[PDB]
Amino acid sequence: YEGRWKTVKVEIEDGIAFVILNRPEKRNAMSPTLNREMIDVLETLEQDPAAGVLVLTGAGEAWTAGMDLKEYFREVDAGPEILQEKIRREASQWQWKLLRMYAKPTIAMVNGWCFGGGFAPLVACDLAICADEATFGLSEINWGIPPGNLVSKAMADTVGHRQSLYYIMTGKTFGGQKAAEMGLVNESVPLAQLREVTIELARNLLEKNPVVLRAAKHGFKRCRELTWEQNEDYLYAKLDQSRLLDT
Amino acid sequence: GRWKTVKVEIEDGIAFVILNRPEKRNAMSPTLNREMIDVLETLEQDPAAGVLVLTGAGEAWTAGMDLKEYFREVDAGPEILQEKIRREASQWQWKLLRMYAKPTIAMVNGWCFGGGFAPLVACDLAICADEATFGLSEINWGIPPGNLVSKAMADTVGHRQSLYYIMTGKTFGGQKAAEMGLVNESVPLAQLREVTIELARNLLEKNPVVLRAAKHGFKRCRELTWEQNEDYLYAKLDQSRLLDTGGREQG
Amino acid sequence: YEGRWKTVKVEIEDGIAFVILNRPEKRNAMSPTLNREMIDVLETLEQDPAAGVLVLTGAGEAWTAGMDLKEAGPEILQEKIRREASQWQWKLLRMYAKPTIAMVNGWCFGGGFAPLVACDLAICADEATFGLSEINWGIPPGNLVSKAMADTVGHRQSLYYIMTGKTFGGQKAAEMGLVNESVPLAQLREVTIELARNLLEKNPVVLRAAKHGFKRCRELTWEQNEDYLYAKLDQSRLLD
Amino acid sequence: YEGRWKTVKVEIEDGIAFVILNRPERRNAMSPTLNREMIDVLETLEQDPAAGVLVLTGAGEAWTAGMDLKEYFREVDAGPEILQEKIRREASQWQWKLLRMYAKPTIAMVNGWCFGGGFAPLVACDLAICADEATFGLSEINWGIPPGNLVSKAMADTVGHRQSLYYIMTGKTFGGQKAAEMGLVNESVPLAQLREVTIELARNLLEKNPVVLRAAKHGFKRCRELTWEQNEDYLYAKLDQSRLL
Amino acid sequence: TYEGRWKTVKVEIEDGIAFVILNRPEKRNAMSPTLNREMIDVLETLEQDPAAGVLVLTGAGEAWTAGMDLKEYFREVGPEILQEKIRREASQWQWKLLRMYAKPTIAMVNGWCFGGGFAPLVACDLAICADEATFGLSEINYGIPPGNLVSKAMADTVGHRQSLYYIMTGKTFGGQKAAEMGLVNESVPLAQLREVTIELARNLLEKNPVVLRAAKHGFKRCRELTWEQNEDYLYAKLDQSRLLD
Amino acid sequence: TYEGRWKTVKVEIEDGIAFVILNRPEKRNAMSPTLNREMIDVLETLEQDPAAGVLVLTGAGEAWTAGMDLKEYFREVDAGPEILQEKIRREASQWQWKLLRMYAKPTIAMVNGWCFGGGFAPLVACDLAICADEATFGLSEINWGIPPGNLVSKAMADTVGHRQSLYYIMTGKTFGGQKAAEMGLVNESVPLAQLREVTIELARNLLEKNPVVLRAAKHGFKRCRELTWEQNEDYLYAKLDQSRLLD
Ligand SMILES: CC(=O)SCCNC(=O)CCNC(=O)[C@H](O)C(C)(C)COP(=O)(O)OP(=O)(O)OC[C@H]1O[C@@H](n2cnc3c(N)ncnc32)[C@H](O)[C@@H]1OP(=O)(O)O
Ligand SMILES: CC(=O)SCCNC(=O)CCNC(=O)[C@H](O)C(C)(C)COP(=O)(O)OP(=O)(O)OC[C@H]1O[C@@H](n2cnc3c(N)ncnc32)[C@H](O)[C@@H]1OP(=O)(O)O
Ligand SMILES: CC(=O)SCCNC(=O)CCNC(=O)[C@H](O)C(C)(C)COP(=O)(O)OP(=O)(O)OC[C@H]1O[C@@H](n2cnc3c(N)ncnc32)[C@H](O)[C@@H]1OP(=O)(O)O
Ligand SMILES: CC(=O)SCCNC(=O)CCNC(=O)[C@H](O)C(C)(C)COP(=O)(O)OP(=O)(O)OC[C@H]1O[C@@H](n2cnc3c(N)ncnc32)[C@H](O)[C@@H]1OP(=O)(O)O
Ligand SMILES: CC(=O)SCCNC(=O)CCNC(=O)[C@H](O)C(C)(C)COP(=O)(O)OP(=O)(O)OC[C@H]1O[C@@H](n2cnc3c(N)ncnc32)[C@H](O)[C@@H]1OP(=O)(O)O
Ligand SMILES: COc1cc(C=O)ccc1O
């Protein structure tokens, strides 16, 4: 994995795969290059047995500062309209299509700045711990666009109706304690203890049968979309599928 | 003096829509309903108005549906009159209001009961007075919550707490309303107007069409799957770029 | 109702029907027998004018320690066994005719979460312990357990407790929104009763419309609900 | 109602309110005037006990040639955005917001051309009889737009998946017989028999209790959206609402 | 044997085919609450009976079912709460147990099918009728909208325009029209009804029962789910089938 | 030239029409994990290729497709790691409907022959379909001892009536091209000798449309099925306006 990707670094320690967004000089802004590389990282790590749990984090002071306004636009305008379709799909592909129902447990370790488009993979990640010192913001409004991709849904899934509208509509920033209070993350802790808390959580997840864990996490995310009567069918099916697959 | 039961004041781009039946604690009559439609429709076309703040005259925000004024009409006409009277209440309370073209803030200055919860939650954001008292009194009056009241709770207040207040009909204060997610914030009545106006000013700074796309998109995306939203939210983004004449000039 | 059921007791006092899960020796673990009796209990108390409100609680230290793992046959029996669990836990309970309160006096694990959340309201003891232990036993949550969490507990929290299987006490359950409130055990029965009596002062048909409407409206758009809620209100006025 | 509206006529006979789109010189294209008049028509006939069933039909050769290319699109598109959104909302308001769950039974009586945007109120009307000679078309694609407003959903509700995509994607026209065969309408008959057949259906409808008829038709259109288990609750509520009212 | 076991219903099993015979022919198999309760017991019993691999729901005499029993419902109902129970019992067998029943089910519609009979007709997986069978949603003419899951049964099997026509008019229709509309798989002469049904039952009996159950259930659920929801759901059913088989 | 490019598929473009030919006719175009991976590549490639205006999905030889490859797609995957199964299923879904159902360009299935089981997903993902009278269809899954996997049962639900769908799923009975057209599974059935001509005529019609506009129209229709009227008022107007932008 060393030197494999230009904009991401992967460090696998004893079952825990740290996936590190690695454009710290651009505050880990999500360029099309990065989107395409994160797709390869998630696919590759899915099939790597040494990666039992994934921790998504950022190099330097940012977690991610959102979409790369420059490189995204640079590539999009260099091509015909239909290029935008491909470029948008690639962002969705790693941010949540692969990530939201990922085969392996995932934890967002939010060490610093998290803006705009970063909310989608933040929520696609199963659980999330952040630094008190981290700063969040849905700054789309202040740039003259509504939240794009699945950002507004990420909010809708995790943060109350009123709170979600306040932050989307104002673009106002908030810290890690506020993010845990509003339910965006599981926990906010001082940055000095971020890695410790995250690793403790990752090892607790490593204790469980991966196939059983997958059945439980996926079934929970899906169940929110189904009625009780539909869930009776769906949730038992996931139960039974787990039993078949769990080996 | 355009409306009998509602006053509108526009200052620096903020339209204060003031429910104006204080003698009745701003209860919602069919007249009020009909006039609120006209108000929302009027203000929508008013380039001077960039944010709406929905508040009450006197001590109440609204004490809810005016039940005498409702029966006055419903029992003087055939069954089908009820259809029209309900459509009119819904029309301003949420059909126009929930997905309103312009940003909306409920400034809950006081009493908020019953049917008041629907326009409350229809309003995008809400700041109340600490001193405000809310309640879902419907149950003690012998009816389940009418109109969209129960959905308004569902959208903003946890399952357990929603059931509790619907089932018991117990009242709660602004702090507890903030706590449960019904409103954004609760502040002392003495600071309610200034707090709402600073929020309102923030919102006037935003591109209107873009704010519209953002707030509508959020409310609708709650109903859709992630994969349905991929399609819907990008559509709202692209629509916002077209309709905003405007410009989006970050870039 | 004395002596009527092997694994449950019903005790009615002045409109309040206490339904007491009664296998203390196995921490009120839910067996096929218990499931069948609970169906009978629910159907009976429905038609009994003496029960105005049901409070679902547990004998001894447990509320319920979840499905009974010991209490094998042809494949088709599993269909019936699963259906019987569902039938009382939420098919009858979630939209029950009468107001229901869970009184969580102690241990609440696994499959207990389903009737916990089907119960309309819930008060628990500070000393009670809850957990979604499924994961530690090697199954995801069965039946309606995960949806039960989805309805009451935030996304992050739900996933945390489901994925880790970590236990939490009464105060945390109230803070998460799992139950309405947590009181010391010493005051659980009194606080529960005060709530029950409050609900007993309502018109039952109206209360029913109100609590059914709210649970269903969560599933419907605002436009659907304009139709559905007014329908429930009018149905209420008919059934008076 | 004689001379009440500029672009629509209402002629009531024996409990049947014939609502006639009345711009035959513009093939009944739906302009902002017509849209606003149609709202007033719907609201008025709702409260008029003389009207027991509405028959939606068109003066001249057309049922409706769709939205007014000039007055609804071209003149508006250039004007204030906020007015555009209001104009769209007014089109919806009569075409389906009031019409799809209308208090009273509704029949579209499709005497001729039906294009584009006419498909929304077509499907909002409970039942529909067209003439064999009527021609239908989702011509939007050929005019450079996808179908606007609720037109696509009007198709989705009544015409199977492959046929809907076919007619939306090609914009090919189809006659009344094909319209009945695909499920867009209930029946197609020669134009010479259209009024008779439609009146006979209206008379059947007029024999039913209005409130019960409302509960049944509303309930059906809503139930398509709900699960069986949600429907147990909802449909029994509609039945009980019906008994109350 | 189940001979003489129930008052209003008969079960006769031949070679794995369980004929469930609605048996109040003097009352055209009207569904009283006694019949509803007995049907609950029948479904629960046949579920666990390995002799029964497929269930065929038919009616004694000239009716399949004339719908809900007017007299015996309106009788057994005061106190209000009793209606809750009676309505449940009706739903319990008609579709709560039946629609997602563990074994494959076939409606064999030999005659009259009205009103409330539509719920179990469509809960049954497949259906064959006689050309001579007559159907109608007479609820409108009795002054109630269709109750229970009747309107959804229609919504699942019959096109939008046709369902509204029949619901709003209450008009009757024969076996051939029932098949044309999609309400049943096939209409055949009465003399061929039993053997066609049996031929189909024999085909179903040849399948792996657990697999058949996954397949029929997953189809009916998938109608309610989006494609992305069904990727998850349908693989879960497949994998569940592989476990349980 | 796409000549020689993929092992198990061919692309031939004539005048804006990209014929995508499933090409294992000696295996009746059974869909192996190789063919699935390659079809993902084909669709991403053709999406960005302005020479391709409309895709026609068809089979070499006597088959359209005989369904998933029992040997390469089921048997051999079953012998592999569990986590591999996850990727294999995803890669089948990826070309069959995740890219294909809302594909950017118009699609037509040209069903020249056998179409079984797994075939039904990409059959209905394709916007339009013409088949030969001589083609034979079947949901054979039940007779191999599985329920329909992947999206097959949803493909049937979207296109074929409730009664007919259960009948064919439950019995496993085959049916011909005319009956496929009658049931709503395809748009039309013609003799095989005319299949190509009729398909190209349709494709030529489709190529006259503004692609961005055609895309909005077919996508909006598919999605509107899932939404209520009030929802569609929002969504369908968003599609119309997005179209006016990108157009
Ligand atoms: C669609 C959406 O995602 S909307 C969200 C878009 N992103 C944002 O609104 C956040 C934008 N960035 C910021 O607010 C600031 O960069 C912060 C708070 C993240 C960091 O502040 P600072 O520590 O003062 O660093 P600074 O602003 O100098 O940025 C460092 C470099 O990162 C670049 N950068 C930061 N964020 C982005 C971004 N989203 N896209 C592209 N470049 C970025 C900066 O332009 C700067 O470039 P340069 O020094 O090579 O010219
Ligand atoms: C499908 C689902 O519901 S997920 C499973 C959810 N439930 C659980 O994880 C709980 C399992 N049980 C426990 O963890 C413990 O019994 C506790 C914490 C509830 C209480 O523990 P203690 O106070 O130490 O008492 P203890 O464990 O000895 O319980 C005594 C009896 O209860 C029985 N019991 C408790 N829960 C269950 C159960 N869920 N199934 C079967 N038996 C149970 C024990 O087997 C034991 O039986 P015995 O006396 O014949 O040997
Ligand atoms: C979303 C939408 O609704 S997109 C638009 C969809 N509508 C259509 O495609 C139909 C367009 N119209 C036509 O194709 C034809 O007019 C037909 C087939 C209906 C009738 O054809 P003809 O009998 O030959 O009449 P003709 O085309 O000359 O129209 C006669 C008058 O009606 C007008 N007219 C017809 N349709 C419309 C329309 N949709 N909007 C505005 N005016 C219309 C014509 O402009 C002409 O008026 P004018 O001479 O004052 O300019
Ligand atoms: C809620 C719902 O399901 S809506 C009610 C649905 N049913 C209907 O609309 C039709 C009711 N019945 C009929 O129309 C006719 O009985 C038919 C067409 C089924 C058969 O007609 P006929 O063969 O001429 O027989 P007839 O009308 O004499 O009925 C025979 C007996 O069955 C009884 N019966 C038939 N249907 C019902 C019913 N739904 N409920 C109670 N009794 C019924 C009749 O009252 C009659 O009783 P009797 O001889 O003991 O006095
Ligand atoms: C979920 C799913 O998709 S399960 C798969 C469902 N598919 C089916 O039920 C169809 C299976 N195939 C058949 O029934 C037949 O092969 C038919 C009707 C399509 C064509 O029959 P024929 O013309 O007699 O050709 P035949 O059966 O000899 O097939 C030719 C070769 O294709 C292979 N083949 C055909 N279908 C498949 C398939 N689905 N998977 C793997 N290999 C296949 C055969 O094994 C044979 O291989 P061989 O020559 O290497 O031994
Ligand atoms: C496209 O993948 C699959 C298709 C099928 C069709 O029956 C079954 C299992 C699968 O994995």
SS3 of chain C = CCCCCCCEEEEEECCEEEEEECCHHHCCCECHHHHHHHHHHHHHHHCCCCCCEEEEEECCCEEECCECCCCCCCCCHHHHHHHHHHHHHHHHCCCCCCCEEEEECCEEEHHHHHHHHHCCEEEEECCCEEECCHHHHCCCCCCCHHHHHHHHCCHHHHHHHHHHCCCEEHHHHHHHCCCCEEECHHHHHHHHHHHHHHHHCCCHHHHHHHHHHHHHHCCCCHHHHHHHHHHHHHHHHHHC
Burial category of C48 from C-beta neighbours within 10 Å (exposed 0-12, middle 13-18, buried 19 and up):
middle
- Give buried/exposed letters for F53-82 (b at 16+ CB in 10 A, else e): bbbbbbbbbebbbbbbbeebbeeebeeeee
Per the listing, tokens 């049943």 go with E184
- CB-CB contact of E128 with E185 (8 Å): yes
With residues binned 3-state (H G I as helix, E B as strand, rest as coil), the percentages for chain F, rounded to 5, are 55, 20, 30
* Residue A72 annotated as catalytic: yes
Q: In this structure, what token pair is assigned to residue F193?
A: 């000798």
Encoding tokens for residue F4?
Answer: 């020689």
Position in ligand 1 atom list of the atom nearest CA A118: 3
F13 touches chain A (CB under 8 A): no
Question: What is the Cα–Cα distance from E1 to F98, expressed in whole angstroms?
Answer: 52
The helix or strand, by DSSP H or E, that contains position A238, with its residue range, turns out to be: helix A228-245
A1 is catalytic: no
In whole angstroms, what is the distance from residue E118 CA to residue E122 CA? Answer: 6
Contacts of D208 (CB under 8 A, 6+ apart): D105, E140, E141, E168, E170
Q: Per-residue b/e over F13-33, b at no fewer than 16 CB within 10 Å?
A: beeebbbbbbbbbebbbbbbb
Interface contact D231-E162, CB threshold 8 A: no
Across the interface, which of C214, C221, C226 has its CB nearest the CB of B163? C214
Is E139 in the active site? yes
Chain centre to alpha carbon of residue C91: 11
Radius of gyration of chain C (CA): 18
Q: Please say whether the beta carbons of A63 and A118 come within 8 A.
A: yes
- Residue A233 forms contact with E (CB below 8 Å): yes
For tokens 């899915």, the residue is: A46
User: From the CA of D12, how far away is ligand 3's center (Å)?
Assistant: 28
**Would you call B10 exposed, middle or buried from its count of C-beta atoms within 10 A (0-12, 13-18, 19+)?**
middle
CA F67 to centroid of ligand 6, rounded, Å:
8
Domains and their CATH numbers in chain C:
1-202 (3.90.226.10), 203-240 (6.10.250.2850)
CA-based nearest residue to A136, from A117, A149, A150: A117
| DSSP 8-state code for residue F129 | E
Cβ-based neighbour number of residue A43 at 10 Å: 15
Buried b (16+ CB within 10 A) or exposed e, A210-225: bbbbbbbbbbbbbbbb
- Round to whole Å and give the CA distance between C223 and B95: 8
Ramachandran area for residue B90 (φ above 0: left; ψ -120 to 50: alpha; else beta) = alpha
User: Strands, E, within F95-142: which ranges?
Assistant: 107-111, 114-116, 128-132, 136-138
Q: Kindly state if the Cβ of A52 falls inside 6 Å of ligand 1.
A: no
- The whole-angstrom distance between A199's CA and the closest CA on chain B is 29
Contact predicate A157/A144, CB 8 Å = no
**Residue of F31, F68, F110, F156 marked active site:** F68
Burial of E202 (0-12, 13-18, 19+ CB in 10 A): middle
CB distance from E229 to chain F under 8 Å? no
Report how far Cα B21 is from the mean position of its chain's Cα atoms.
17
Q: Of the listed A72, A137, A167, A176, which one is catalytic?
A: A72
Contact status, residue B29 vs residue B68, Cβ threshold 8 Å: no
Minimal CA separation from F144 to chain B, in Å: 32
CA C39 to centroid of ligand 2, rounded, Å: 23
Three-state secondary structure along chain D?
Answer: CCCCCCCEEEEEECCEEEEEECCHHHCCCECHHHHHHHHHHHHHHHHCCCCCEEEEEECCCEEECCECHHHHHHHHHCCCHHHHHHHHHHHHHHHHHCCCCCCCCEEEEECCEEEHHHHHHHHHCCEEEEECCCEEECCHHHHCCCCCCCHHHHHHHHCCHHHHHHHHHHCCCEEHHHHHHCCCCCEEECHHHHHHHHHHHHHHHHCCCHHHHHHHHHHHHHHCCCCHHHHHHHHHHHHHHHHHC
Instruction: Measure the CA dihedral D69/D70/D72/D74, to 10°.
Output: 90
Integer CA distances (angstroms), C39 to A233, C70, E244, in order: 20, 21, 27
Enumerate residues 6+ apart whose C-beta is below 8 A from D220.
E146, E151, E154, E155, E163, E164, E167
Contacting residues of F for A46, CB less than 8 Å apart: 83, 86-87
Q: Is the CB of A26 under 6 A from ligand 1?
A: yes
Instruction: Return the number of other C-beta atoms located less than 10 Å from residue A246's C-beta.
Output: 17
CB contact under 8 A, C43 and E102: no
- D152 contacts on F by Cβ (under 8 Å): 217, 220-221, 224, 232, 236
- Which strands sit side by side in the sheet containing A113-115, from one edge to the other? A62-64, A113-115, A135-137, A174-175
User: F84-95 as b/e, with b when 16 or more CB fall inside 10 Å?
Assistant: bbbbbbbbbbbb
Q: What are phi and psi of D241, to 5 degrees?
A: -60, -40
State how far the Cα of F113 lies from the Cα of F131, in Å rounded to an integer: 8
Phi first, then psi: give them for residue B51, nearest 5 degrees.
-145, 140
Encoded tokens for C187: 């005051």
Which residues are registered as beta bridge partners of D64? D114
Q: Residue F209 contacts by C-beta under 8 Å, 6 or more apart in sequence?
A: D141, D142, D169, F106
> Length of chain E, please?
245
What gap in Å lies between CA E169 and CA E138, rounded to an integer? 8
- Cα–Cα distance measured from residue A80 to residue D230, given in angstroms and rounded to the nearest whole number: 47
F39 is catalytic: no
What CA–CA distances, in Å, run from F159 to A148, B195, D109, F184? Answer: 32, 55, 28, 6
- With H, G, I as helix, E, B as strand and everything else as coil, classify residue E21: strand
User: Residue E31 C-alpha to ligand 4 middle, in angstroms?
Assistant: 11
Closest CA to C219 of F23, F213, D233: D233
Fill in the amino acid letter for E225: L
Among protein residues, the one with the nearest Cα to ligand 4's atom 44 is E27
Q: How far, in Å, CA of B8 to CA of B23, rounded? A: 18
Q: For residue C225, which of A132, D59, A44, D230 has the smallest C-alpha distance? A: D230
Burial (CB count <10 Å: 0-12, 13-18, 19+), residue E71: exposed
Structure tokens at A23: 């454009």
Known catalytic membership, residue A102: no
Query: Which residue among E28, E69, E76 has the greatest number of ligand 4 atoms within 8 angstroms of its CB, and so is best to mutate?
Result: E28
* Shortest Cα–Cα distance, F202 to chain D (Å): 8
User: Of E38, E153, E145, E54, which Cα lies nearest the Cα of E90?
Assistant: E38
Q: How far apart are CA C49 and CA C51, in angstroms?
A: 6
Cis amide linkage into residue E79, ω under 30° from 0: yes
D8-13/C168-169 β-pairing: unpaired
Cα B248 → chain centroid: 28
The closest CB to that of D47, out of B41, B44, B84, belongs to: B84
Rg, chain D, Cα only: 18
Q: How many Cβ atoms sit within 10 Å of the Cβ of residue D181?
A: 14
Q: Is B181 on the interface with C (CB under 8 A)?
A: no
Give residue D205's Cα distance to chain centre.
17
Residues in chain E closer than 8 A to B225 (CB atoms): 226, 228-229
Concatenate the DSSP letters of all residues of B169-195 into one string. ---EEHHHHHHHTSSSEEE-HHHHHHH
Walk across the sheet containing C121-125 and list its strands: C8-13, C16-21, C53-58, C100-104, C121-125, C181-183
Given an 8 Å threshold on Cβ–Cβ distance, is F240 in contact with D164?
no
| Residue D100 sits at the chain C interface (C-beta within 8 Å) | no
Contact in structure between C182 and C124 (CB atoms under 8 Å): yes
Mutate to test the interface with A, among B226, B231, B239, B250 (most CBs of A within 10 A): B226
Task: Give the residue, by CA position, lying nearest to ligand 5 atom 19.
Answer: F66
- Three-point CA angle A78, A82, A86, nearest 5°: 90
Name residue B54's beta-bridge partners: B17, B106
Contact E168, E110 (CB under 8 A): no
E205, E16 Cβ separation under 8 angstroms: yes
| C-beta separation of F120 from E186 below 8 A | no
Fill in the amino acid letter for D1.
Y
* Of C138, E207, E226, B168, residue with least CA distance to F97: E226
CA–centroid distance, A26 to ligand 1, in Å, is 6
Experiment type: X-ray
Give the distance (Å) from ligand 6 centre to CA of residue C180. Answer: 46
* Strands B6-11 and B14-19, bridge-based pairing: antiparallel
By alpha-carbon position, which residue is closest to atom 18 of ligand 1? A113
Coil, strand or helix: which one is A140?
Answer: helix
Strands A135-137 and A113-115, sheet pairing: parallel
D143 CB less than 6 Å from ligand 3?
yes
A140 in ligand 1 pocket by Cβ < 6 Å? yes
Gap between the Cα atoms of B11 and D130, Å rounded: 55
Helix or strand or coil: residue F136? strand
Q: How far apart are CA C17 and CA C57, in angstroms?
A: 11
Residues A96 and A124: beta-carbon distance below 8 Å: yes
Which tokens in the block code for residue A53?
Answer: 């749990």
> How many CB contacts within 8 angstroms connect chain B with chain F?
40
Cβ-defined contacts of D177-181 (< 8 Å, 24+): D177/D132, D178/D136, D179/D110, D179/D130, D179/D134, D179/D136, D180/D130
- How many other CB atoms are there within 10 angstroms of residue C13's CB atom? 11
Which element (helix H / strand E) includes B7? strand B6-11
Asked if residue D59 has its Cβ within 6 Å of ligand 3, the reply is: no
Of A224, A226, A242, the CB nearest to C140: A242
Contacts of F171 (CB under 8 A, 6+ apart): E200, E203, E204, F142
Q: H or E element: which one contains B112? A: strand B111-113
Q: Which has the closest alpha carbon to E1: E52, E71, E66, E72?
A: E52
Largest Cα span, chain F = 51
∠D216-E152-D167 over CA atoms, to 5°? 95
Reported in sequence order, the residue ranges of chain E that DSSP labels E, i.e. its strands, are: 9-14, 17-22, 54-59, 63-65, 105-109, 112-114, 126-130, 134-136, 173-174, 186-188
Atom of ligand 5 nearest to the CA of F68: 3
Give the integer Cα–Cα distance in Å for C223 and C229. 10
Q: Which residues of A47-79 are buried (b: 16+ CB within 10 A; e: fewer)?
A: eeeebbbbbbbbbbebbbbbbbeebbeebbeee
Q: At what angle do helices C222-239 and D210-223 cross, to 10 degrees?
A: 140
SS (HEC) of F49-62? CCCCCEEEEEECCC
**Both ends of chain B: CA-CA distance in Å?**
45
Lining ligand 5 with CB less than 6 A are F 27-28, 30, 63, 66-71, 114, 116-118, 140-141, 144, 149
**What are the Cα distances from residue F187, in Å, to C222, D161, F131?**
36, 9, 8
d(CA E51, CA E54): 9
Side-chain half-sphere exposure of E2, counting CA atoms within 13 A:
22
**E164 part of contact set with chain C, CB < 8 Å:** no
CB B45 within 8 A of CB B8: no
Q: Quote the DSSP letter at residue F24.
A: -
Strand F136-138, strand F114-116: pairing:
parallel
CB atoms within 10 A of CB B110: 24
Residues near F13 by beta carbon (within 8 Å), at least 6 away in sequence: F2, F19, F51, F52
Q: Where do the DSSP E strands lie in E61-183?
A: 63-65, 105-109, 112-114, 126-130, 134-136, 173-174
Give the span between the Cα atoms of A205 and C135, in whole angstroms: 10
Q: Which amino acid is at B210?
A: V
Looking at the complex, does the CB of residue D50 fall below 8 Å from at least one CB of chain B?
no
What's the gap in Å between E27 CA and the centre of ligand 4? 6
Nearest to residue E89, comparing CAs of E102, E79, E76, E78? E76
Using CA of residue D22, residue D26, residue D28, residue D31, what is the dihedral sign?
Answer: negative
Nearest CA-CA distance, residue A229 and chain D, Å: 7
- Pairwise CA distance, residues F35 & F68, whole Å: 10
Is the shortest distance between the CB of A113 and ligand 1 below 6 Å?
yes
Tell me which of D30, D61, D69, D75 to substitute to probe ligand 3's pocket, judged by most ligand atoms within 8 Å of the beta carbon.
Answer: D69
User: Are residues F120 and F139 in contact, defined by beta-carbon separation less than 8 angstroms?
Assistant: yes
F12 bridge partner residues:
F19
* Tokens found for residue A231: 């869930």
* All residues at 6 or more sequence positions from E4 whose CB lies less than 8 Å from its CB, including other chains: none
Instruction: State which amino acid sits at residue E96.
Output: K
Residue D91: how many CB atoms within 10 A of its CB? 27
Contact in structure between B192 and B107 (CB atoms under 8 Å): yes
Q: What distance in Å separates the CA atoms of residue E130 and residue F88, rounded to the nearest whole number? A: 47
Q: Under a CB-based contact definition with an 8 Å cutoff, are residues E20 and E5 in contact?
A: no
**Contact between E150 and D218 (Cβ < 8 Å):** no
Residue ranges of alpha helices (H) inside B91-225 are 117-122, 138-141, 149-156, 159-168, 174-180, 189-204, 208-221
